[PDB]
Design a protein around this ligand. Structure first.
Ligand code: MN
Lengths: 349, 349
């Protein structure tokens, strides 16, 4: 039966936003984080991981998702030395299972993790936000790897590069008891001459099939998939739930059509995603995992640099999912839990 | 069946600005008062228009007026009351004379509310307002004038007197309010039971009916503050809310959360499982009855190093309140078949 742990992203010691503050978000249970002192491709030690955990748990919370044991471009590129990098991935996996963290979250997106044309695009209310202006700048080389991809490696070269990968790590993932969750490409389509393959329903279906197991699931990031209208998140989310292969939810809204795309407040009505439908769906399928609001607007004096990762609107995101998850739970004769063990401290009757 | 999510604003001197109040997803209405005519004297249109103007330019409207204060002398049924009830008559005239459809007021001797502690700690390390009975047991509440206003109430005004003093006031001002199109909504007493041997009468289901009945008319309404009434365990807010809804008698909604006991009470996060009120059931009611007027999340906790010193009127947890209600509303409207709505014209500029 259902079990959704409201979660927040936290970059660790050097985060603008603190655990004190994250904890104050009504219903917050999971911290979604990573090790940041180990170079990409290089293998996370247990101590790095337990350091983060000790901090997070003292704050009165738990790490429920490692967001991103990063994939070395060499691996993505399909270069001969991959196995070396892959064996390191296997260690990091083994190490996270060792810390008791249920899920690992990763992308297979070549040289770029995300693309945004404007980082302060105005919205109909004064708040800024990020957008992808299909017009602006677009159609210019970003000023060796890129040319490699552009020239040689096809999408199906990437499909085989990727299957090699997940075929290498999955048994390790299984023994650690860690659920992999592949993060869609963002935007979910070819740019810059680079290829993207994790982009829609057909790909989620081919990907899961790469290695048929729950240890091999997706991170349903509705705002990424829906950054291309060619995509319908609802049937995608459902297909994926019907199949038991969502291991992580992100839940940011986005407005889109043929013109490009722009991130908006989480509220279904502010963008093109019916967020109620999304969580109603998480409800009826007794989904068990974690959800993060993910990405916000710049509202108020918001001084967090690091892009959509300011506290305020992301917090205003979780409490909206609080209302959505709770109302839908009740509607179905289901009793919602938010992990509150005490209303008060020291008073009581 | 359209509920206009609103938010209280204190005029030009508020550290919370409308730029900020505007940025909360779905926020439409503002809730405000005039703060320069001393109390029982008349409210000049010059003073109200210039607040609407300040509001209407920021994208928001004035949806409801949080308090033209009834003067003590009116409440005490003193002889000089008619002069004061006069000014109050016009106050009602000027407000209708400026589009704003709801005036909210109270009938609570001596105090507008009483707490014992404005930084009581909660389990998540944040602080919130509490009223601890056992901590106000010791206390004995102009400064030398209040003394004998209390004495007057204590000794010479019984509940039934105060009921009669309210009766007068009501049939005095109620025609005026039907003549200006303004709807009166009375706040529950907070706490909803006597303290310091001072009477309170707007305290529960009984009071509601009797009050409603002084003037069986849709302009004679309550502000249904679930939190105020839920501060007494003896009360069933879900029943009281429904009761008042069948009579078309809700002219405003406050949706603050408390946890109560024989011990007193404390304000909590708006979220249900954090307090004692099932907000979902509340808004479900509001929905199931096609209610119309504005809802105001109330009293937020004190989180994220907020410094604003007014009661529970920082921006943050009040804002986290509102978008929790967005989610609770939306999810309920769809669970019915109705379609929700927020301030929302353009997704993008
Ligand atoms: Mn209130």
């Amino acid at each position: 039966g259902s079990h959704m742990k409201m979660s927040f992203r936290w970059y660790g010691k050097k985060d603008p936003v603190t655990l004190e503050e994250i904890k104050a978000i009504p219903g917050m249970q999971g911290i979604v984080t990573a090790v940041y002192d180990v170079p990409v491709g290089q293998a996370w030690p247990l101590e790095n991981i337990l350091e983060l955990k000790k901090m997070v748990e003292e704050a009165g919370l738990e790490i429920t998702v490692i967001e991103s044991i990063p994939v070395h471009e060499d691996i993505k590129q399909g270069k001969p030395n991959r196995d070396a990098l892959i064996e390191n991935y296997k260690t990091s996996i083994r190490n996270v299972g060792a810390a008791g963290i249920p899920v690992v979250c990763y992308n297979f997106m070549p040289v770029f993790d995300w693309t945004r044309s404007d980082l302060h695009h105005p919205l109909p209310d004064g708040s800024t936000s990020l957008a992808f202006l299909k017009s602006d700048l677009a159609g210019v080389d970003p000023v060796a790897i890129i040319e490699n991809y552009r020239q040689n490696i096809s999408e199906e070269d990437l499909w085989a590069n990727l299957e090699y990968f997940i075929k290498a790590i999955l048994p390790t993932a299984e023994e650690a008891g860690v659920k992999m969750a592949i993060h869609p490409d963002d935007p979910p389509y070819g740019i810059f001459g680079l290829p993207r393959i994790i982009t829609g329903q057909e790909a989620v279906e081919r990907f899961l099939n790469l290695y048929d197991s729950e240890h091999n699931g997706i991170t349903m990031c509705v705002g990424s998939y829906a950054s291309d209208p060619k995509n319908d998140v609802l049937a995608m989310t459902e297909y994926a739930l019907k199949r038991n292969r969502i291991n992580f939810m992100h839940t940011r809204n986005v407005t889109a059509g043929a013109w490009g795309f722009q991130e908006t407040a989480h509220l279904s009505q502010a963008g093109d995603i019916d967020m109620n439908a999304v969580v109603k769906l998480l409800v009826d399928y007794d989904w068990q995992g974690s959800l993060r609001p993910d990405h916000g607007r710049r509202i108020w004096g918001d001084q967090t640099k690091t892009p959509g990762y300011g506290l305020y609107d992301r917090a205003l995101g979780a409490t909206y999912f609080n209302g959505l998850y709770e109302a839908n739970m009740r509607a179905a004769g289901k009793t919602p839990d938010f992990g509150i063990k005490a209303k008060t401290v020291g008073t009581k009757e």
